[PDB]
Amino acid sequence: YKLQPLTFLLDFSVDGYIRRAIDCGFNDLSQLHCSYESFDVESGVYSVS
Amino acid sequence: YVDVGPDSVKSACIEVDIQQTFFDKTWPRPIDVSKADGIIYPQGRTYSNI
Amino acid sequence: GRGVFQNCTAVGVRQQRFVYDAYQNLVGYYSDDGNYYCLRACVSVPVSVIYDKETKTHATLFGSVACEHISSTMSQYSRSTRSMLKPVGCVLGLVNSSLFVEDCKLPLGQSLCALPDTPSTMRLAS
Amino acid sequence: QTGFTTTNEAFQKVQDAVNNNAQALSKLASELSNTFGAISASIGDIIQRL
Amino acid sequence: DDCMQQICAQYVAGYKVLPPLMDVNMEAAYTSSLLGSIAGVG
């Protein structure tokens, strides 16, 4: 798989290992996660680019 | 330059058969960042449960 | 940088020796030898002044600092000021002036803190 | 007496006020330190760029 | 001390949170007196 410069939302566990991630540019939903920097966003109607 | 070893003493290369159609299969294994597939850890640092 | 180390659990990855948190600031690490030292930053001691213009009698308050932790004419702190200002006073924070004056003696007061009113003419904490 | 955490608009107003002053203080004041300008962090360029 | 035993107020930014000017007991005294006067004042 190719690599390229992206922004991700990384979840570090207590032992410092990454077990969850999100890439902001895929699924308006994931843009919405990268904003708010959370894996849980409250329900609502959100404007998206 | 390094002592790799001696060059090949053989005078011919083994015969090679290309059959591309035998190697054309479909076993999709896409990247799934929901479980951190293919993540390069940040280089100089670590983090706690943030 | 500066900071205070401490024997401490072991979070992180341990192959990179530095563990940060959400920012640059470095919090915890794996020292050569094998221990987890979760470090803090060097702390300051806040200070305030109670004036009473009339009698020109002032007092010093160290907000939320225990009596034991600091001492008068303290020389363990670098502090910028040229000189200082002319005790069990930590009712709310350590204060360097006469205290525990007659309880019912603050119908109205300067109000150094939540409870004490500092009526001078000293004689604080009422 | 039972429901305060459960839907109660007034209880949320209290939490909003607490969050407002907490976010102002901690977030703004503590986070504009760290990385305002163009060099390093809060080092002041002592050891490097002396 | 609680910053010793591990709060950014003391640790880095000079910021200090001032005390409320009234301890919880005095505020409670005020509201308790009001509750006592409810029935009669109206």
PDB file of C-alpha atoms in Angstrom:
ATOM      1  CA  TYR A   1       0.000   0.000   0.000  1.00  0.00           C
ATOM      2  CA  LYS A   2       1.259   3.452  -0.913  1.00  0.00           C
ATOM      3  CA  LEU A   3       1.999   6.158   1.642  1.00  0.00           C
ATOM      4  CA  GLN A   4       1.247   9.854   1.379  1.00  0.00           C
ATOM      5  CA  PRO A   5       1.073  12.839   3.751  1.00  0.00           C
ATOM      6  CA  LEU A   6      -2.236  12.796   5.590  1.00  0.00           C
ATOM      7  CA  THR A   7      -3.742  13.878   8.879  1.00  0.00           C
ATOM      8  CA  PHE A   8      -4.992  11.116  11.156  1.00  0.00           C
ATOM      9  CA  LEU A   9      -6.741  10.909  14.485  1.00  0.00           C
ATOM     10  CA  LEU A  10      -4.713   8.434  16.522  1.00  0.00           C
ATOM     11  CA  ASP A  11      -5.842   6.724  19.710  1.00  0.00           C
ATOM     12  CA  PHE A  12      -2.992   5.836  22.042  1.00  0.00           C
ATOM     13  CA  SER A  13      -3.862   3.265  24.665  1.00  0.00           C
ATOM     14  CA  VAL A  14      -2.418   3.324  28.175  1.00  0.00           C
ATOM     15  CA  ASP A  15       0.532   1.216  27.051  1.00  0.00           C
ATOM     16  CA  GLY A  16       1.146   3.670  24.231  1.00  0.00           C
ATOM     17  CA  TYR A  17       0.045   1.441  21.355  1.00  0.00           C
ATOM     18  CA  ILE A  18      -2.252   2.653  18.595  1.00  0.00           C
ATOM     19  CA  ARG A  19      -5.316   0.454  18.243  1.00  0.00           C
ATOM     20  CA  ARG A  20      -7.664   2.962  16.580  1.00  0.00           C
ATOM     21  CA  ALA A  21      -7.248   5.608  13.922  1.00  0.00           C
ATOM     22  CA  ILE A  22      -9.291   7.793  11.594  1.00  0.00           C
ATOM     23  CA  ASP A  23      -8.276   9.550   8.397  1.00  0.00           C
ATOM     24  CA  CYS A  24      -9.872  12.953   8.159  1.00  0.00           C
ATOM     25  CA  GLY A  25     -10.343  13.033   4.396  1.00  0.00           C
ATOM     26  CA  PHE A  26     -12.748  10.144   3.922  1.00  0.00           C
ATOM     27  CA  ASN A  27     -16.387  10.095   5.035  1.00  0.00           C
ATOM     28  CA  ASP A  28     -17.618  13.568   5.967  1.00  0.00           C
ATOM     29  CA  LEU A  29     -18.212  11.697   9.221  1.00  0.00           C
ATOM     30  CA  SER A  30     -14.478  11.218   9.652  1.00  0.00           C
ATOM     31  CA  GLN A  31     -13.829  14.874   8.902  1.00  0.00           C
ATOM     32  CA  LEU A  32     -16.323  15.495  11.672  1.00  0.00           C
ATOM     33  CA  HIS A  33     -14.355  13.194  13.975  1.00  0.00           C
ATOM     34  CA  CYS A  34     -11.036  14.867  13.213  1.00  0.00           C
ATOM     35  CA  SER A  35     -12.721  18.063  14.180  1.00  0.00           C
ATOM     36  CA  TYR A  36     -13.635  17.628  17.852  1.00  0.00           C
ATOM     37  CA  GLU A  37     -10.736  15.128  17.940  1.00  0.00           C
ATOM     38  CA  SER A  38     -12.974  12.417  19.313  1.00  0.00           C
ATOM     39  CA  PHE A  39     -14.306   9.019  18.398  1.00  0.00           C
ATOM     40  CA  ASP A  40     -17.740  10.106  19.655  1.00  0.00           C
ATOM     41  CA  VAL A  41     -19.487  13.154  18.213  1.00  0.00           C
ATOM     42  CA  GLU A  42     -22.896  14.218  19.456  1.00  0.00           C
ATOM     43  CA  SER A  43     -25.889  13.758  17.207  1.00  0.00           C
ATOM     44  CA  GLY A  44     -26.839  16.769  15.142  1.00  0.00           C
ATOM     45  CA  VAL A  45     -26.876  18.313  11.697  1.00  0.00           C
ATOM     46  CA  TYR A  46     -23.373  19.390  10.740  1.00  0.00           C
ATOM     47  CA  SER A  47     -22.302  21.521   7.811  1.00  0.00           C
ATOM     48  CA  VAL A  48     -19.589  19.784   5.791  1.00  0.00           C
ATOM     49  CA  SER A  49     -17.347  21.085   3.029  1.00  0.00           C
TER      50      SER A  49
ATOM     51  CA  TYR B   1      33.265  -1.846  -0.563  1.00  0.00           C
ATOM     52  CA  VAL B   2      32.388  -5.060   1.232  1.00  0.00           C
ATOM     53  CA  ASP B   3      33.440  -8.700   0.949  1.00  0.00           C
ATOM     54  CA  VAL B   4      30.068  -9.906  -0.277  1.00  0.00           C
ATOM     55  CA  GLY B   5      31.520 -13.239  -1.346  1.00  0.00           C
ATOM     56  CA  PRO B   6      32.580 -14.898  -4.588  1.00  0.00           C
ATOM     57  CA  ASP B   7      30.716 -14.382  -7.833  1.00  0.00           C
ATOM     58  CA  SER B   8      28.517 -17.141  -9.195  1.00  0.00           C
ATOM     59  CA  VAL B   9      30.588 -19.910 -10.752  1.00  0.00           C
ATOM     60  CA  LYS B  10      27.641 -21.252 -12.748  1.00  0.00           C
ATOM     61  CA  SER B  11      27.666 -20.567 -16.480  1.00  0.00           C
ATOM     62  CA  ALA B  12      23.897 -20.385 -17.021  1.00  0.00           C
ATOM     63  CA  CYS B  13      20.811 -19.222 -15.148  1.00  0.00           C
ATOM     64  CA  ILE B  14      17.951 -21.535 -14.235  1.00  0.00           C
ATOM     65  CA  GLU B  15      15.013 -21.439 -16.641  1.00  0.00           C
ATOM     66  CA  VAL B  16      12.067 -19.301 -15.525  1.00  0.00           C
ATOM     67  CA  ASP B  17       8.438 -19.794 -16.584  1.00  0.00           C
ATOM     68  CA  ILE B  18       5.998 -16.872 -16.435  1.00  0.00           C
ATOM     69  CA  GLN B  19       2.326 -17.802 -16.063  1.00  0.00           C
ATOM     70  CA  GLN B  20       0.644 -14.572 -15.019  1.00  0.00           C
ATOM     71  CA  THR B  21      -2.874 -16.002 -15.218  1.00  0.00           C
ATOM     72  CA  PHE B  22      -2.081 -18.450 -12.427  1.00  0.00           C
ATOM     73  CA  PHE B  23      -1.248 -15.583 -10.069  1.00  0.00           C
ATOM     74  CA  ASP B  24      -4.354 -13.498 -10.843  1.00  0.00           C
ATOM     75  CA  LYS B  25      -6.603 -13.996  -7.821  1.00  0.00           C
ATOM     76  CA  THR B  26      -8.861 -11.744  -5.752  1.00  0.00           C
ATOM     77  CA  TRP B  27      -8.319 -11.819  -1.989  1.00  0.00           C
ATOM     78  CA  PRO B  28      -9.233  -8.268  -0.987  1.00  0.00           C
ATOM     79  CA  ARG B  29      -7.529  -7.148   2.217  1.00  0.00           C
ATOM     80  CA  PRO B  30      -8.126  -3.398   2.312  1.00  0.00           C
ATOM     81  CA  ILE B  31      -6.606  -0.977   4.775  1.00  0.00           C
ATOM     82  CA  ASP B  32      -8.827  -0.679   7.850  1.00  0.00           C
ATOM     83  CA  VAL B  33      -7.653   2.167  10.074  1.00  0.00           C
ATOM     84  CA  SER B  34     -10.354   1.220  12.562  1.00  0.00           C
ATOM     85  CA  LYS B  35      -7.763  -1.284  13.792  1.00  0.00           C
ATOM     86  CA  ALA B  36      -4.661   0.714  12.857  1.00  0.00           C
ATOM     87  CA  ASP B  37      -3.654  -1.163   9.730  1.00  0.00           C
ATOM     88  CA  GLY B  38      -0.356   0.080   8.361  1.00  0.00           C
ATOM     89  CA  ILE B  39       0.325   2.797  10.938  1.00  0.00           C
ATOM     90  CA  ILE B  40       3.888   4.038  11.343  1.00  0.00           C
ATOM     91  CA  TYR B  41       4.339   5.079  14.949  1.00  0.00           C
ATOM     92  CA  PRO B  42       5.543   8.646  15.558  1.00  0.00           C
ATOM     93  CA  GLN B  43       9.287   8.506  15.684  1.00  0.00           C
ATOM     94  CA  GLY B  44      10.779  10.051  18.798  1.00  0.00           C
ATOM     95  CA  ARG B  45       7.936  10.008  21.292  1.00  0.00           C
ATOM     96  CA  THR B  46       5.200   7.999  22.973  1.00  0.00           C
ATOM     97  CA  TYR B  47       1.891   8.878  24.589  1.00  0.00           C
ATOM     98  CA  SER B  48      -0.457   7.646  27.286  1.00  0.00           C
ATOM     99  CA  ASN B  49      -4.183   7.037  26.875  1.00  0.00           C
ATOM    100  CA  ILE B  50      -4.754  10.403  25.156  1.00  0.00           C
TER     101      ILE B  50
ATOM    102  CA  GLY C   1      14.619  21.896  30.838  1.00  0.00           C
ATOM    103  CA  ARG C   2      13.578  21.984  34.470  1.00  0.00           C
ATOM    104  CA  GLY C   3      11.392  19.685  36.490  1.00  0.00           C
ATOM    105  CA  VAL C   4      10.984  17.260  39.348  1.00  0.00           C
ATOM    106  CA  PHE C   5      11.373  13.537  38.771  1.00  0.00           C
ATOM    107  CA  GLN C   6       9.728  10.778  40.755  1.00  0.00           C
ATOM    108  CA  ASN C   7       9.653   6.997  40.862  1.00  0.00           C
ATOM    109  CA  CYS C   8       6.525   6.210  38.936  1.00  0.00           C
ATOM    110  CA  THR C   9       4.604   3.357  37.222  1.00  0.00           C
ATOM    111  CA  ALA C  10       5.632   2.655  33.583  1.00  0.00           C
ATOM    112  CA  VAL C  11       3.250   3.896  30.948  1.00  0.00           C
ATOM    113  CA  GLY C  12       4.408   4.425  27.375  1.00  0.00           C
ATOM    114  CA  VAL C  13       6.142   2.230  24.835  1.00  0.00           C
ATOM    115  CA  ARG C  14       9.670   2.081  26.411  1.00  0.00           C
ATOM    116  CA  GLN C  15      11.510   1.953  23.101  1.00  0.00           C
ATOM    117  CA  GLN C  16      11.184   5.676  22.685  1.00  0.00           C
ATOM    118  CA  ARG C  17      12.171   6.977  26.083  1.00  0.00           C
ATOM    119  CA  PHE C  18      10.064  10.169  26.071  1.00  0.00           C
ATOM    120  CA  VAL C  19       6.318  10.189  26.721  1.00  0.00           C
ATOM    121  CA  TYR C  20       4.457  13.451  26.113  1.00  0.00           C
ATOM    122  CA  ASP C  21       0.840  14.495  26.574  1.00  0.00           C
ATOM    123  CA  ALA C  22      -1.390  16.234  24.060  1.00  0.00           C
ATOM    124  CA  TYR C  23       1.134  19.058  23.634  1.00  0.00           C
ATOM    125  CA  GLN C  24       4.883  19.467  23.512  1.00  0.00           C
ATOM    126  CA  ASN C  25       5.393  19.332  27.257  1.00  0.00           C
ATOM    127  CA  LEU C  26       7.342  16.257  28.309  1.00  0.00           C
ATOM    128  CA  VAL C  27       5.690  14.218  31.099  1.00  0.00           C
ATOM    129  CA  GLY C  28       7.325  10.939  32.187  1.00  0.00           C
ATOM    130  CA  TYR C  29      10.102   8.936  30.492  1.00  0.00           C
ATOM    131  CA  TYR C  30      12.262   5.763  30.649  1.00  0.00           C
ATOM    132  CA  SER C  31      15.661   6.594  32.249  1.00  0.00           C
ATOM    133  CA  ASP C  32      18.798   4.582  31.396  1.00  0.00           C
ATOM    134  CA  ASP C  33      18.921   1.773  34.096  1.00  0.00           C
ATOM    135  CA  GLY C  34      15.203   0.938  33.802  1.00  0.00           C
ATOM    136  CA  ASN C  35      12.776   3.071  35.767  1.00  0.00           C
ATOM    137  CA  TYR C  36       9.712   5.133  34.892  1.00  0.00           C
ATOM    138  CA  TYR C  37      10.160   8.704  36.121  1.00  0.00           C
ATOM    139  CA  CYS C  38       7.024  10.777  35.555  1.00  0.00           C
ATOM    140  CA  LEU C  39       8.353  14.317  35.778  1.00  0.00           C
ATOM    141  CA  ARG C  40       6.525  17.554  36.514  1.00  0.00           C
ATOM    142  CA  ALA C  41       7.514  21.174  35.990  1.00  0.00           C
ATOM    143  CA  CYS C  42       9.241  23.337  38.568  1.00  0.00           C
ATOM    144  CA  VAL C  43       6.567  25.042  40.627  1.00  0.00           C
ATOM    145  CA  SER C  44       6.150  28.666  41.686  1.00  0.00           C
ATOM    146  CA  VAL C  45       4.900  30.159  44.948  1.00  0.00           C
ATOM    147  CA  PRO C  46       2.190  32.805  44.414  1.00  0.00           C
ATOM    148  CA  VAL C  47       2.241  35.892  46.599  1.00  0.00           C
ATOM    149  CA  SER C  48      -0.001  38.868  47.318  1.00  0.00           C
ATOM    150  CA  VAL C  49       0.095  41.951  49.527  1.00  0.00           C
ATOM    151  CA  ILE C  50      -2.469  43.321  51.990  1.00  0.00           C
ATOM    152  CA  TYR C  51      -1.976  47.057  52.254  1.00  0.00           C
ATOM    153  CA  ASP C  52      -4.304  49.167  54.469  1.00  0.00           C
ATOM    154  CA  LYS C  53      -3.266  52.594  53.167  1.00  0.00           C
ATOM    155  CA  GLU C  54      -4.365  54.375  56.349  1.00  0.00           C
ATOM    156  CA  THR C  55      -1.990  52.826  58.867  1.00  0.00           C
ATOM    157  CA  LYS C  56       0.508  51.892  56.117  1.00  0.00           C
ATOM    158  CA  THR C  57       0.737  48.415  57.660  1.00  0.00           C
ATOM    159  CA  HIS C  58       1.092  45.623  55.114  1.00  0.00           C
ATOM    160  CA  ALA C  59       1.092  41.810  55.214  1.00  0.00           C
ATOM    161  CA  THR C  60       2.079  39.016  52.851  1.00  0.00           C
ATOM    162  CA  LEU C  61      -0.189  36.191  51.702  1.00  0.00           C
ATOM    163  CA  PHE C  62       0.993  33.036  49.963  1.00  0.00           C
ATOM    164  CA  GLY C  63      -2.100  31.671  48.275  1.00  0.00           C
ATOM    165  CA  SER C  64      -2.784  27.983  48.879  1.00  0.00           C
ATOM    166  CA  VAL C  65       0.665  27.336  50.358  1.00  0.00           C
ATOM    167  CA  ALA C  66       1.052  25.285  53.518  1.00  0.00           C
ATOM    168  CA  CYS C  67       2.687  26.767  56.596  1.00  0.00           C
ATOM    169  CA  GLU C  68       5.425  24.119  56.661  1.00  0.00           C
ATOM    170  CA  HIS C  69       6.267  24.406  52.985  1.00  0.00           C
ATOM    171  CA  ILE C  70       7.721  27.915  53.096  1.00  0.00           C
ATOM    172  CA  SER C  71       9.589  30.077  55.578  1.00  0.00           C
ATOM    173  CA  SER C  72      10.095  33.780  56.138  1.00  0.00           C
ATOM    174  CA  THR C  73      13.023  35.353  54.299  1.00  0.00           C
ATOM    175  CA  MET C  74      13.023  32.262  52.127  1.00  0.00           C
ATOM    176  CA  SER C  75      16.319  31.633  50.294  1.00  0.00           C
ATOM    177  CA  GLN C  76      15.303  28.414  48.445  1.00  0.00           C
ATOM    178  CA  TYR C  77      13.416  30.485  45.803  1.00  0.00           C
ATOM    179  CA  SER C  78      15.195  32.423  42.967  1.00  0.00           C
ATOM    180  CA  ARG C  79      12.501  35.294  42.773  1.00  0.00           C
ATOM    181  CA  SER C  80      13.334  38.430  40.678  1.00  0.00           C
ATOM    182  CA  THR C  81      12.581  41.252  43.284  1.00  0.00           C
ATOM    183  CA  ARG C  82      15.658  43.039  44.882  1.00  0.00           C
ATOM    184  CA  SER C  83      14.563  42.366  48.574  1.00  0.00           C
ATOM    185  CA  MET C  84      11.555  41.010  50.564  1.00  0.00           C
ATOM    186  CA  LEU C  85       8.872  42.738  52.726  1.00  0.00           C
ATOM    187  CA  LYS C  86       9.061  43.839  56.420  1.00  0.00           C
ATOM    188  CA  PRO C  87       4.323  31.401  61.335  1.00  0.00           C
ATOM    189  CA  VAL C  88       1.191  29.264  61.613  1.00  0.00           C
ATOM    190  CA  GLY C  89      -0.946  31.499  59.439  1.00  0.00           C
ATOM    191  CA  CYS C  90      -2.268  29.046  56.838  1.00  0.00           C
ATOM    192  CA  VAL C  91      -5.965  29.435  57.538  1.00  0.00           C
ATOM    193  CA  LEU C  92      -6.605  29.647  53.783  1.00  0.00           C
ATOM    194  CA  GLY C  93      -3.066  30.273  52.701  1.00  0.00           C
ATOM    195  CA  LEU C  94       0.059  31.024  54.658  1.00  0.00           C
ATOM    196  CA  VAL C  95       0.112  34.687  55.686  1.00  0.00           C
ATOM    197  CA  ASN C  96       3.046  36.328  57.534  1.00  0.00           C
ATOM    198  CA  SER C  97       1.305  38.597  60.132  1.00  0.00           C
ATOM    199  CA  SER C  98      -0.380  38.406  63.604  1.00  0.00           C
ATOM    200  CA  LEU C  99      -3.573  36.277  63.366  1.00  0.00           C
ATOM    201  CA  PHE C 100      -6.365  34.561  65.405  1.00  0.00           C
ATOM    202  CA  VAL C 101      -7.482  37.976  66.778  1.00  0.00           C
ATOM    203  CA  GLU C 102     -10.850  38.097  68.697  1.00  0.00           C
ATOM    204  CA  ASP C 103     -13.215  35.854  66.625  1.00  0.00           C
ATOM    205  CA  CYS C 104     -16.305  38.145  66.430  1.00  0.00           C
ATOM    206  CA  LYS C 105     -14.318  41.177  65.144  1.00  0.00           C
ATOM    207  CA  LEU C 106     -15.180  41.418  61.400  1.00  0.00           C
ATOM    208  CA  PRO C 107     -18.757  42.790  60.855  1.00  0.00           C
ATOM    209  CA  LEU C 108     -17.097  44.484  57.818  1.00  0.00           C
ATOM    210  CA  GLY C 109     -13.491  43.947  56.625  1.00  0.00           C
ATOM    211  CA  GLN C 110     -10.885  44.356  53.838  1.00  0.00           C
ATOM    212  CA  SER C 111     -11.514  40.597  53.209  1.00  0.00           C
ATOM    213  CA  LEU C 112      -8.089  39.076  52.476  1.00  0.00           C
ATOM    214  CA  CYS C 113      -9.672  35.723  51.656  1.00  0.00           C
ATOM    215  CA  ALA C 114     -13.018  33.964  51.800  1.00  0.00           C
ATOM    216  CA  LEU C 115     -13.245  34.041  55.631  1.00  0.00           C
ATOM    217  CA  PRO C 116     -10.582  36.464  57.152  1.00  0.00           C
ATOM    218  CA  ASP C 117     -11.253  40.263  56.989  1.00  0.00           C
ATOM    219  CA  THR C 118      -7.752  41.567  58.101  1.00  0.00           C
ATOM    220  CA  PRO C 119      -8.835  44.554  60.362  1.00  0.00           C
ATOM    221  CA  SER C 120      -5.560  46.433  61.147  1.00  0.00           C
ATOM    222  CA  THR C 121      -5.885  49.562  63.386  1.00  0.00           C
ATOM    223  CA  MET C 122      -2.019  43.066  61.619  1.00  0.00           C
ATOM    224  CA  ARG C 123      -4.739  41.488  63.744  1.00  0.00           C
ATOM    225  CA  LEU C 124      -5.904  39.518  60.740  1.00  0.00           C
ATOM    226  CA  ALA C 125      -7.915  36.307  60.474  1.00  0.00           C
ATOM    227  CA  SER C 126     -11.323  37.069  62.033  1.00  0.00           C
TER     228      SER C 126
ATOM    229  CA  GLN D   1     -34.931  14.906  44.095  1.00  0.00           C
ATOM    230  CA  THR D   2     -34.354  11.969  41.755  1.00  0.00           C
ATOM    231  CA  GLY D   3     -33.441  13.382  38.372  1.00  0.00           C
ATOM    232  CA  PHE D   4     -30.639  15.947  37.988  1.00  0.00           C
ATOM    233  CA  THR D   5     -28.202  14.043  35.671  1.00  0.00           C
ATOM    234  CA  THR D   6     -31.259  12.898  33.617  1.00  0.00           C
ATOM    235  CA  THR D   7     -32.717  15.428  31.132  1.00  0.00           C
ATOM    236  CA  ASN D   8     -32.891  18.729  33.114  1.00  0.00           C
ATOM    237  CA  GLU D   9     -32.126  21.941  31.111  1.00  0.00           C
ATOM    238  CA  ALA D  10     -31.286  23.953  34.283  1.00  0.00           C
ATOM    239  CA  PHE D  11     -28.669  21.369  35.410  1.00  0.00           C
ATOM    240  CA  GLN D  12     -26.975  21.734  31.977  1.00  0.00           C
ATOM    241  CA  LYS D  13     -26.836  25.567  32.445  1.00  0.00           C
ATOM    242  CA  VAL D  14     -24.819  24.962  35.643  1.00  0.00           C
ATOM    243  CA  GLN D  15     -22.438  22.667  33.814  1.00  0.00           C
ATOM    244  CA  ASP D  16     -22.184  25.181  30.982  1.00  0.00           C
ATOM    245  CA  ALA D  17     -21.121  27.924  33.383  1.00  0.00           C
ATOM    246  CA  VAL D  18     -18.535  25.662  34.997  1.00  0.00           C
ATOM    247  CA  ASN D  19     -17.230  24.652  31.577  1.00  0.00           C
ATOM    248  CA  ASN D  20     -17.150  28.261  30.426  1.00  0.00           C
ATOM    249  CA  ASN D  21     -14.895  29.567  33.130  1.00  0.00           C
ATOM    250  CA  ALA D  22     -12.786  26.402  33.204  1.00  0.00           C
ATOM    251  CA  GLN D  23     -12.213  26.484  29.459  1.00  0.00           C
ATOM    252  CA  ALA D  24     -11.390  30.185  29.434  1.00  0.00           C
ATOM    253  CA  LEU D  25      -8.841  29.899  32.200  1.00  0.00           C
ATOM    254  CA  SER D  26      -7.141  26.605  31.524  1.00  0.00           C
ATOM    255  CA  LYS D  27      -7.463  26.304  27.773  1.00  0.00           C
ATOM    256  CA  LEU D  28      -6.666  29.839  26.705  1.00  0.00           C
ATOM    257  CA  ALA D  29      -4.099  30.953  29.255  1.00  0.00           C
ATOM    258  CA  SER D  30      -2.255  27.640  29.506  1.00  0.00           C
ATOM    259  CA  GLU D  31      -2.267  26.878  25.790  1.00  0.00           C
ATOM    260  CA  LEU D  32      -1.153  30.174  24.329  1.00  0.00           C
ATOM    261  CA  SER D  33       2.004  29.372  26.185  1.00  0.00           C
ATOM    262  CA  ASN D  34       3.725  26.332  24.546  1.00  0.00           C
ATOM    263  CA  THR D  35       3.961  27.447  20.899  1.00  0.00           C
ATOM    264  CA  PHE D  36       3.070  31.013  19.944  1.00  0.00           C
ATOM    265  CA  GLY D  37       6.013  32.148  17.901  1.00  0.00           C
ATOM    266  CA  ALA D  38       8.549  30.992  15.307  1.00  0.00           C
ATOM    267  CA  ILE D  39      11.314  29.316  17.395  1.00  0.00           C
ATOM    268  CA  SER D  40      11.190  26.056  19.439  1.00  0.00           C
ATOM    269  CA  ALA D  41       8.804  26.362  22.432  1.00  0.00           C
ATOM    270  CA  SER D  42       9.345  28.319  25.706  1.00  0.00           C
ATOM    271  CA  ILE D  43      13.146  27.626  25.720  1.00  0.00           C
ATOM    272  CA  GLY D  44      14.006  31.258  24.819  1.00  0.00           C
ATOM    273  CA  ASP D  45      16.907  29.996  22.622  1.00  0.00           C
ATOM    274  CA  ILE D  46      19.415  29.662  25.536  1.00  0.00           C
ATOM    275  CA  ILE D  47      21.458  26.497  24.660  1.00  0.00           C
ATOM    276  CA  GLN D  48      20.745  26.813  20.878  1.00  0.00           C
ATOM    277  CA  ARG D  49      20.811  30.131  18.906  1.00  0.00           C
ATOM    278  CA  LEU D  50      22.781  31.518  21.921  1.00  0.00           C
TER     279      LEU D  50
ATOM    280  CA  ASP E   1       1.095  20.563  48.176  1.00  0.00           C
ATOM    281  CA  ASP E   2      -1.395  18.720  45.985  1.00  0.00           C
ATOM    282  CA  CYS E   3       0.728  19.819  43.039  1.00  0.00           C
ATOM    283  CA  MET E   4       3.733  18.373  44.874  1.00  0.00           C
ATOM    284  CA  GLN E   5       2.061  14.969  45.272  1.00  0.00           C
ATOM    285  CA  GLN E   6       1.559  14.243  41.575  1.00  0.00           C
ATOM    286  CA  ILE E   7      -2.963  22.714  39.260  1.00  0.00           C
ATOM    287  CA  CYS E   8      -1.358  24.489  36.327  1.00  0.00           C
ATOM    288  CA  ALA E   9      -1.931  27.655  38.384  1.00  0.00           C
ATOM    289  CA  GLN E  10       1.086  26.938  40.663  1.00  0.00           C
ATOM    290  CA  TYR E  11       2.903  24.712  38.088  1.00  0.00           C
ATOM    291  CA  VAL E  12       3.466  27.173  35.186  1.00  0.00           C
ATOM    292  CA  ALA E  13       1.257  30.129  34.143  1.00  0.00           C
ATOM    293  CA  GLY E  14       1.301  32.772  36.926  1.00  0.00           C
ATOM    294  CA  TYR E  15      -2.540  32.655  37.013  1.00  0.00           C
ATOM    295  CA  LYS E  16      -4.152  32.256  40.466  1.00  0.00           C
ATOM    296  CA  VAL E  17      -7.799  31.507  41.179  1.00  0.00           C
ATOM    297  CA  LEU E  18      -9.003  33.815  43.918  1.00  0.00           C
ATOM    298  CA  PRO E  19     -11.172  32.558  46.790  1.00  0.00           C
ATOM    299  CA  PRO E  20     -14.925  33.195  46.574  1.00  0.00           C
ATOM    300  CA  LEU E  21     -15.184  35.810  49.436  1.00  0.00           C
ATOM    301  CA  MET E  22     -17.734  33.603  51.214  1.00  0.00           C
ATOM    302  CA  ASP E  23     -17.217  30.166  52.629  1.00  0.00           C
ATOM    303  CA  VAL E  24     -19.863  27.569  51.920  1.00  0.00           C
ATOM    304  CA  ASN E  25     -21.148  27.770  55.484  1.00  0.00           C
ATOM    305  CA  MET E  26     -21.952  31.475  55.232  1.00  0.00           C
ATOM    306  CA  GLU E  27     -23.789  31.049  51.932  1.00  0.00           C
ATOM    307  CA  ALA E  28     -25.689  28.126  53.404  1.00  0.00           C
ATOM    308  CA  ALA E  29     -26.582  30.282  56.394  1.00  0.00           C
ATOM    309  CA  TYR E  30     -28.049  32.890  54.057  1.00  0.00           C
ATOM    310  CA  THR E  31     -30.166  30.416  52.122  1.00  0.00           C
ATOM    311  CA  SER E  32     -31.234  28.631  55.304  1.00  0.00           C
ATOM    312  CA  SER E  33     -32.444  31.887  56.826  1.00  0.00           C
ATOM    313  CA  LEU E  34     -34.390  32.582  53.646  1.00  0.00           C
ATOM    314  CA  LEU E  35     -36.000  29.146  53.858  1.00  0.00           C
ATOM    315  CA  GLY E  36     -36.923  29.850  57.453  1.00  0.00           C
ATOM    316  CA  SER E  37     -38.604  33.097  56.484  1.00  0.00           C
ATOM    317  CA  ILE E  38     -40.547  31.649  53.508  1.00  0.00           C
ATOM    318  CA  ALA E  39     -43.830  30.911  55.250  1.00  0.00           C
ATOM    319  CA  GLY E  40     -44.037  34.035  57.363  1.00  0.00           C
ATOM    320  CA  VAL E  41     -42.843  36.748  55.010  1.00  0.00           C
ATOM    321  CA  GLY E  42     -45.441  35.981  52.346  1.00  0.00           C
TER     322      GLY E  42
END
